Amino acid sequence: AQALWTRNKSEITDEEYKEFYKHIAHDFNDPLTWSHNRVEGKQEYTSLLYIPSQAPWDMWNRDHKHGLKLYVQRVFIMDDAEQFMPNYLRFVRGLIDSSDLPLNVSREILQDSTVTRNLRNALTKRVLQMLEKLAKDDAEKYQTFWQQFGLVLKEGPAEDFANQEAIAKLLRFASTHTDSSAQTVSLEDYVSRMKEGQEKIYYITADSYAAAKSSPHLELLRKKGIEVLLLSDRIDEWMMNYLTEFDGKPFQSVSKVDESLEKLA
Amino acid sequence: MATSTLIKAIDGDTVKLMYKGQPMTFRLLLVDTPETKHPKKGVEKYGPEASAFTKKMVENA
């Protein structure tokens, strides 16, 4: 029973982490996973991040709850300090201790300052780590994650399309594969089921999944062995506005034709 | 081939997949290239550790 964030990982079993998440966030859902890192030398900061199973209501409120508990030298300064994670990584909730950032540090310093800017990108490495790691840690956890924070990661490829591919691997969409609202199939899972001549990634853009699903012709293609991605997210339309291609395979609308016949021509 | 592929499900005529939105985002995404061996600490998985072994039952769900 000590300050768990400054404690060494060897003593800190899973019990310690799963309890401490509920304690620090004032939340009572479980963490899917966590990333405890101790860093020293130049920047003496000890980070302890958690991935929520469920999205709090204040994840999409005008009053903010996304972010970490800011500590400086074991001393709590601020709560919900999101200036350690960009708005596209807003889901990460936990705490971070710094010996670099001042003790009188404000929310304004957290956003603007270059040392804290380097702190924020250093933690972005842990976010990418936890995300892909979570998908292979337990695919059920990442399924739960996306059904809560799926709109959040779609701010990513719409921001920077240069490294959109790193986020595109992580992105989950719905499909004709299954008539369920659970967004299971990634761009990974699409490429895995791609047929001969299917050089394009097929999408259907919809205001609601039920509206997409109400269409009979979905089963026509699944009967033939083709999968069409049913996209129902409002933000998705702005996400694919930048995400034009993944894995060398360019994207295709339902209202357009592709080269499937061209190979068999 | 028609104006669209054999999939006639929520079509119109033609479209550049989907587009048009207000730039609400600011700037920062994931790193690409440098697999930095120095930042690690949280090594391996914390679900079934690796393939499940010895310890792994139900404790770390």
Side-chain angles (χ1 to χ4, degrees), chain A residues 187-202 225-227 246-250:
Chain A
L187 297 178
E188 298 289 289
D189 296 302
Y190 193 89
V191 177
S192 184
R193 303 191 70 232
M194 287 180 70
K195 293 300 184 63
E196 55 175 72
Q198 186 179 274
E199 187 174 73
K200 290 284 179 54
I201 319 295
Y202 311 141
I226 308 176
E227 184 189 86
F246 165 79
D247 193 55
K249 292 74 180 175

Short mmCIF file of all heavy atoms in Angstrom, two decimals, chain A residues 187-202 225-227 246-250:
data_model
loop_
_atom_site.label_atom_id
_atom_site.label_comp_id
_atom_site.label_asym_id
_atom_site.label_seq_id
_atom_site.Cartn_x
_atom_site.Cartn_y
_atom_site.Cartn_z
N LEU A 187 -9.94 -2.97 -41.50
CA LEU A 187 -9.34 -3.00 -42.84
C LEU A 187 -8.37 -4.20 -42.96
O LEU A 187 -8.16 -4.73 -44.05
CB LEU A 187 -8.65 -1.65 -43.15
CG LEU A 187 -9.58 -0.40 -43.20
CD1 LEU A 187 -8.79 0.91 -43.48
CD2 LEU A 187 -10.72 -0.59 -44.24
N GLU A 188 -7.81 -4.64 -41.80
CA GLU A 188 -7.04 -5.90 -41.67
C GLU A 188 -7.90 -7.10 -42.11
O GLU A 188 -7.50 -7.88 -42.99
CB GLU A 188 -6.61 -6.13 -40.19
CG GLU A 188 -5.69 -5.07 -39.59
CD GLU A 188 -4.27 -5.11 -40.17
OE1 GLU A 188 -3.52 -6.07 -39.86
OE2 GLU A 188 -3.88 -4.19 -40.91
N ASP A 189 -9.08 -7.22 -41.48
CA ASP A 189 -10.00 -8.35 -41.68
C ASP A 189 -10.59 -8.36 -43.10
O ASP A 189 -10.96 -9.42 -43.61
CB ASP A 189 -11.13 -8.33 -40.62
CG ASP A 189 -10.63 -8.53 -39.17
OD1 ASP A 189 -9.99 -9.57 -38.89
OD2 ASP A 189 -10.89 -7.67 -38.31
N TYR A 190 -10.68 -7.16 -43.72
CA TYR A 190 -11.14 -7.04 -45.12
C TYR A 190 -10.10 -7.69 -46.05
O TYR A 190 -10.44 -8.56 -46.85
CB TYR A 190 -11.38 -5.57 -45.55
CG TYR A 190 -12.16 -5.48 -46.88
CD1 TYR A 190 -13.55 -5.43 -46.90
CD2 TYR A 190 -11.50 -5.47 -48.12
CE1 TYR A 190 -14.25 -5.38 -48.10
CE2 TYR A 190 -12.19 -5.41 -49.31
CZ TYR A 190 -13.56 -5.37 -49.29
OH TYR A 190 -14.26 -5.30 -50.48
N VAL A 191 -8.83 -7.23 -45.92
CA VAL A 191 -7.70 -7.71 -46.76
C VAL A 191 -7.53 -9.23 -46.63
O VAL A 191 -7.22 -9.92 -47.61
CB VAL A 191 -6.35 -6.95 -46.47
CG1 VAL A 191 -5.16 -7.52 -47.31
CG2 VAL A 191 -6.50 -5.43 -46.71
N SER A 192 -7.81 -9.74 -45.42
CA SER A 192 -7.75 -11.18 -45.11
C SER A 192 -8.80 -11.98 -45.93
O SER A 192 -8.53 -13.11 -46.34
CB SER A 192 -7.95 -11.38 -43.60
OG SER A 192 -7.82 -12.74 -43.22
N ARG A 193 -9.98 -11.37 -46.20
CA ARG A 193 -11.10 -12.04 -46.92
C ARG A 193 -11.22 -11.59 -48.40
O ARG A 193 -12.20 -11.94 -49.07
CB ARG A 193 -12.44 -11.77 -46.19
CG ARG A 193 -12.47 -12.20 -44.70
CD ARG A 193 -13.89 -12.15 -44.13
NE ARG A 193 -14.74 -13.23 -44.69
CZ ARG A 193 -15.96 -13.08 -45.26
NH1 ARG A 193 -16.52 -11.88 -45.35
NH2 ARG A 193 -16.61 -14.15 -45.71
N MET A 194 -10.22 -10.83 -48.91
CA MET A 194 -10.26 -10.29 -50.30
C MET A 194 -10.16 -11.41 -51.36
O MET A 194 -9.27 -12.26 -51.29
CB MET A 194 -9.15 -9.22 -50.52
CG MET A 194 -9.44 -7.89 -49.82
SD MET A 194 -8.15 -6.65 -50.08
CE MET A 194 -8.37 -6.28 -51.81
N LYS A 195 -11.08 -11.37 -52.33
CA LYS A 195 -11.19 -12.38 -53.41
C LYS A 195 -10.36 -12.00 -54.64
O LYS A 195 -9.85 -10.88 -54.75
CB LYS A 195 -12.68 -12.56 -53.82
CG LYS A 195 -13.58 -13.19 -52.73
CD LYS A 195 -13.10 -14.60 -52.33
CE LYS A 195 -14.03 -15.29 -51.32
NZ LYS A 195 -15.38 -15.51 -51.89
N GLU A 196 -10.24 -12.96 -55.58
CA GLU A 196 -9.65 -12.75 -56.91
C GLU A 196 -10.41 -11.64 -57.67
O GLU A 196 -11.65 -11.62 -57.69
CB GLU A 196 -9.67 -14.08 -57.72
CG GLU A 196 -11.07 -14.72 -57.85
CD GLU A 196 -11.10 -15.95 -58.76
OE1 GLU A 196 -10.58 -17.01 -58.35
OE2 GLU A 196 -11.64 -15.86 -59.89
N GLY A 197 -9.65 -10.69 -58.22
CA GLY A 197 -10.23 -9.58 -58.98
C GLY A 197 -10.69 -8.42 -58.11
O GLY A 197 -10.76 -7.28 -58.59
N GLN A 198 -10.97 -8.69 -56.82
CA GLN A 198 -11.39 -7.68 -55.84
C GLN A 198 -10.15 -6.83 -55.46
O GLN A 198 -9.44 -7.15 -54.52
CB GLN A 198 -12.03 -8.37 -54.60
CG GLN A 198 -12.64 -7.40 -53.57
CD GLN A 198 -13.29 -8.12 -52.38
OE1 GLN A 198 -14.45 -8.51 -52.43
NE2 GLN A 198 -12.56 -8.26 -51.29
N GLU A 199 -9.88 -5.81 -56.28
CA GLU A 199 -8.70 -4.92 -56.13
C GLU A 199 -9.06 -3.68 -55.28
O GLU A 199 -8.18 -2.97 -54.78
CB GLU A 199 -8.23 -4.53 -57.56
CG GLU A 199 -6.90 -3.75 -57.65
CD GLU A 199 -6.41 -3.53 -59.09
OE1 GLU A 199 -7.00 -2.71 -59.82
OE2 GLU A 199 -5.46 -4.23 -59.53
N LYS A 200 -10.37 -3.47 -55.11
CA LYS A 200 -10.93 -2.33 -54.38
C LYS A 200 -11.57 -2.77 -53.06
O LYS A 200 -12.02 -3.92 -52.91
CB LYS A 200 -11.98 -1.62 -55.28
CG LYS A 200 -11.39 -0.88 -56.50
CD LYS A 200 -10.73 0.46 -56.12
CE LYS A 200 -10.13 1.18 -57.33
NZ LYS A 200 -11.11 1.37 -58.42
N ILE A 201 -11.58 -1.84 -52.09
CA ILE A 201 -12.25 -2.02 -50.80
C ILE A 201 -13.66 -1.42 -50.90
O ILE A 201 -13.80 -0.22 -51.12
CB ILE A 201 -11.45 -1.31 -49.63
CG1 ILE A 201 -9.91 -1.51 -49.77
CG2 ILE A 201 -11.94 -1.80 -48.24
CD1 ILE A 201 -9.40 -2.93 -49.64
N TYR A 202 -14.71 -2.25 -50.78
CA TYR A 202 -16.11 -1.80 -51.01
C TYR A 202 -16.71 -1.24 -49.72
O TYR A 202 -16.58 -1.86 -48.66
CB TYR A 202 -16.99 -2.96 -51.55
CG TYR A 202 -16.38 -3.73 -52.73
CD1 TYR A 202 -16.51 -5.12 -52.84
CD2 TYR A 202 -15.63 -3.07 -53.72
CE1 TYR A 202 -15.93 -5.81 -53.87
CE2 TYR A 202 -15.06 -3.77 -54.76
CZ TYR A 202 -15.21 -5.14 -54.83
OH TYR A 202 -14.62 -5.84 -55.84
N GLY A 225 -19.83 -14.62 -51.81
CA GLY A 225 -18.58 -14.68 -51.04
C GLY A 225 -17.84 -13.35 -50.97
O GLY A 225 -16.67 -13.31 -50.58
N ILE A 226 -18.53 -12.27 -51.34
CA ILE A 226 -18.02 -10.89 -51.26
C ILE A 226 -18.53 -10.23 -49.96
O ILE A 226 -19.67 -10.48 -49.53
CB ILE A 226 -18.50 -10.05 -52.51
CG1 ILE A 226 -18.14 -10.79 -53.85
CG2 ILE A 226 -17.90 -8.62 -52.49
CD1 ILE A 226 -18.64 -10.10 -55.11
N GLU A 227 -17.67 -9.39 -49.36
CA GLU A 227 -17.99 -8.63 -48.15
C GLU A 227 -17.97 -7.13 -48.49
O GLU A 227 -17.02 -6.66 -49.12
CB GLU A 227 -16.94 -8.95 -47.05
CG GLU A 227 -17.21 -8.29 -45.68
CD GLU A 227 -16.04 -8.45 -44.69
OE1 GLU A 227 -15.12 -7.61 -44.73
OE2 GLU A 227 -16.03 -9.41 -43.90
N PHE A 246 -5.49 2.03 -48.30
CA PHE A 246 -4.85 1.24 -47.23
C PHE A 246 -4.20 -0.02 -47.84
O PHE A 246 -4.85 -0.72 -48.63
CB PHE A 246 -5.90 0.84 -46.15
CG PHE A 246 -5.48 -0.28 -45.19
CD1 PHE A 246 -4.63 -0.02 -44.11
CD2 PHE A 246 -5.94 -1.58 -45.37
CE1 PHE A 246 -4.25 -1.04 -43.25
CE2 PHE A 246 -5.56 -2.59 -44.51
CZ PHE A 246 -4.72 -2.32 -43.45
N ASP A 247 -2.93 -0.28 -47.45
CA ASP A 247 -2.17 -1.52 -47.81
C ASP A 247 -1.92 -1.63 -49.35
O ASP A 247 -1.58 -2.70 -49.88
CB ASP A 247 -2.90 -2.77 -47.23
CG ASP A 247 -2.07 -4.06 -47.24
OD1 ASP A 247 -0.94 -4.06 -46.70
OD2 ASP A 247 -2.52 -5.08 -47.82
N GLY A 248 -2.03 -0.47 -50.04
CA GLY A 248 -1.88 -0.40 -51.50
C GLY A 248 -3.21 -0.54 -52.23
O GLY A 248 -3.30 -0.23 -53.42
N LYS A 249 -4.25 -0.98 -51.50
CA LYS A 249 -5.60 -1.18 -52.05
C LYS A 249 -6.42 0.12 -51.88
O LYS A 249 -6.67 0.54 -50.74
CB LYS A 249 -6.33 -2.34 -51.33
CG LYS A 249 -5.78 -3.76 -51.59
CD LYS A 249 -4.44 -4.05 -50.88
CE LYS A 249 -3.93 -5.46 -51.18
NZ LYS A 249 -2.59 -5.69 -50.59
N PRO A 250 -6.84 0.78 -53.00
CA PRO A 250 -7.67 2.00 -52.92
C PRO A 250 -9.15 1.68 -52.65
O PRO A 250 -9.63 0.56 -52.89
CB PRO A 250 -7.44 2.66 -54.29
CG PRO A 250 -7.15 1.52 -55.23
CD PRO A 250 -6.55 0.41 -54.40
#
